[PDB]
From a paper:
Protein Phosphatase 1 (PP1; 37.5 kDa) is the most widely expressed and abundant PPP. PP1 requires two metal ions at its active site for folding and activity (M1 and M2; coordinated by three and four residues, respectively), as they activate a water molecule to facilitate phosphate hydrolysis from substrates. Two of the most evolutionarily ancient regulators of PP1 that participate in these processes are suppressor-of-Dis2-number 2 (SDS22; PPP1R7) and Inhibtor-3 (126 aa; I3; PPP1R11 also referred to as YPI1, HCGV, IPP3, or TCTEX5). As is typical for most PP1 regulators, SDS22 and I3 form two distinct heterodimeric complexes with PP1 (SDS22:PP1 and I3:PP1) and, when bound, each potently inhibits PP1 activity.
Residue numbers in the entry:
A (entry chain C): 37 to 60
B (entry chain A): 5 to 300
C (entry chain B): 79 to 360
């Protein structure tokens, strides 16, 4: 068939976890 | 015309385990040959790379040579794994030469299992970056830096893994309508202050902006989650894999895991106190994250 | 005699009095927040504080044997606290927040001043640095070349990535050998009448339309002029006096659209061994 991007079970969705992000 | 690749790689790997800050003195001709030879390989491969899994994707290095060595021990030294770096190899702490030289050397030794995209730190000016220019003239001369820009001007700009993962240093561009526009960009070229090539190396995502916004960097733009979603649907992609911004855990998702930010330099500057990550993709295109915690 | 604490996370300079005759102290990437507790190390020639968080220069008045001082990649905003280091030969203040050149009047033996990547807007207050051989002011906001007339020993002037619009004020730099003015707004090549010893001239990434007024620069070895607006092949006659011209950069000029581009460069400049990135001879 096609090929789909999946994520392993250990990987955490840190999008809404208030992770800090800076522009260098 | 001839350069002992293994002699160079040996002296570069010889500093492994040392307390970061330790150097490797290559000859001027050795560095120049690394630039020239790798430049021929960059020009002989497309500017929009089409890569297949499995491979390990890394974000910014910012000259942190000792964290690059740690990445290769975790991920496996080339050719044990395939690598795609997303740019920003140079920066300041007087170890940018070792970082770029080892990556260029591996690029020359394994040209179809090791890949380097262009970051905004691989520019052809000192309009926004001074550390690498500063390091070249302090350890050698300004002309050595000019030769590096010749190499930089021929780096590829983006990569698509198995027709599903779009990779670039910065992000999307409001001028990007078709992949053909990226493939038509001719090399050598510098990074403009406006346009597709600039945004591909400079733009950022933003939760706040509804579509396209202005960038607090003073260059390029910011795009939002909606931009990401339209981009993946228009081009039948699953994910945008990008770098360019320091993130806490070395990785950070955006727009319901439709974008990921990678950063492979732990403790950038030493004031944010971030980890480094590295994304591993396997043959069935499944993604796992290995994390490099700051040594100090 | 030599002490190296590069990248040791030390957050305060404490307890360095134990060193009797230390001569070089390296404290880069330590996260230092202030200069202090150094008045005892009275034998130091070199002090290196590259990449910390020092916000002001101070407490250095003691070290009068200092010859090399590097406070780059900190958060400095003004130049001060150096008036006593008279034997300073090299001084690096790269990538700070400095806005004005001041307080260097007493460093008469200074051979190299490096103020790249700052917010300087004019060239001033360096008339006293007679022994200057290398002046680095790239990546600033300078808008005119001025007050350079005292630096008669200067051999390298780096002024790339600024806001210059005219080449001027170089009449007295008679020993100038390397001139870097790439990424500016220069439109005309001029004002180089007295810089006969130039071997390296760089005006790439500007808005220059014609190569002129460099026929006297018979010592040119490298001519970097990529990313300009050159259109006339006859302009290359100006470089025929440079019989040791080895490298020329002309790519991304209109000239390179010519399908005889490489042929025409070699015909005009038979001494050239490198054209843009690639070699020609040997
Ligand atoms: Fe970047």
């Amino acid at each position: 068939p096609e090929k789909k991007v999946e994520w392993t079970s250990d990987t955490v969705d840190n999008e809404h976890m208030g992770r800090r992000s800076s522009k260098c | 015309g001839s350069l002992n690749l293994d002699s160079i790689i040996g002296r570069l790997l010889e500093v492994q385990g040392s307390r970061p800050g330790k150097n490797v003195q290559l000859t001027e001709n050795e560095i120049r040959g690394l630039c020239l030879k790798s430049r021929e390989i960059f020009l002989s491969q497309p500017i929009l790379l089409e890569l297949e899994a499995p491979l390990k994707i890394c974000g910014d290095i910012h000259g942190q040579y000792y964290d690059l060595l740690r990445l290769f021990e975790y991920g496996g030294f080339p050719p044990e794994s395939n690598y795609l770096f997303l740019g920003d190899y140079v920066d300041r702490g007087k170890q940018s030469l070792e970082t770029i030289c080892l990556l260029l050397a591996y690029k020359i030794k394994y040209p179809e299992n090791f890949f380097l995209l262009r970051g905004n730190h691989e520019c052809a000016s000192i309009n926004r970056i001074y550390g690498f220019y500063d390091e070249c003239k302090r350890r050698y001369n300004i002309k050595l830096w000019k030769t590096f820009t010749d190499c930089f001007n021929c780096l590829p700009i983006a990569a698509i893994v198995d027709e599903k993962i779009f990779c670039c240093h910065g992000g999307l561009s409001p001028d990007l309508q078709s992949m053909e526009q990226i493939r038509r960009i001719m090399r050598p070229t510098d990074v403009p202050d406006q346009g597709l090539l600039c945004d591909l190396l400079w733009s950022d995502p933003d939760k706040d902006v509804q579509g396209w916004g202005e960038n607090d960097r003073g260059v390029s733009f910011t795009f939002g989650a909606e931009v990401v979603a339209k981009f993946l649907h228009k081009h039948d992609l699953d994910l945008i894999c990008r770098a360019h911004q320091v993130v806490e855990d070395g990785y950070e998702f955006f727009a319901k895991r439709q974008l990921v930010t990678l950063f492979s330099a732990p403790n950038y500057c030493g004031e944010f106190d971030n980890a480094g990550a590295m994304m591993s993709v396997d043959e069935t295109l499944m993604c796992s994250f290995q994390i490099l915690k700051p040594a100090d | 005699e030599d002490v190296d604490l590069n990248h040791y996370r030390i957050g305060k300079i404490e307890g360095f009095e134990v060193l009797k005759k230390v001569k070089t102290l390296c404290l880069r990437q330590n996260l230092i927040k202030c200069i202090e507790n150094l008045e005892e190390l009275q034998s130091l020639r070199e002090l290196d504080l590259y990449d910390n968080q020092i916000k002001k220069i101070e407490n250095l008045e003691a070290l009068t044997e200092l010859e090399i001082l590097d406070i780059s990649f900190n958060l400095l905003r003004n130049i001060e606290g150096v008036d006593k280091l008279t034997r300073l030969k090299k001084l690096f203040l790269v990538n700070n927040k400095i806005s004005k050149i001041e307080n260097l009047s007493n460093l008469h033996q200074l051979q190299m001043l490096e103020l790249g990547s700052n917010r300087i807007r004019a060239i001033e207050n360096i008339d006293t640095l007679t022994n200057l051989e290398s002046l680095f002011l790239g990546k600033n906001k300078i808008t005119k070349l001025q007050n350079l007339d005292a630096l008669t020993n200067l051999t390298v002037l780096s002024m790339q990535s600024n806001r210059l619009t005219k080449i001027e004020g170089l009449q007295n730099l008679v020993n100038l050998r390397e001139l870097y003015l790439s990424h500016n707004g220069i439109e005309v090549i001029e004002g180089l009448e007295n810089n006969n010893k130039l071997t390296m001239l760089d005006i790439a990434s500007n808005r220059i339309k014609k190569i002129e007024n460099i026929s006297h620069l018979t010592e040119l070895q490298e001519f970097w002029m990529n990313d300009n607006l050159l259109e006339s092949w006859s302009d290359l006659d100006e470089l025929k006096g440079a019989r040791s011209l080895e490298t020329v950069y002309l790519e991304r000029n209109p000239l390179q659209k010519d399908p005889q581009y490489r042929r025409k460069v070699m015909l005009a400049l038979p001494s050239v061994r490198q054209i843009d990135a690639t070699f020609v001879r040997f």
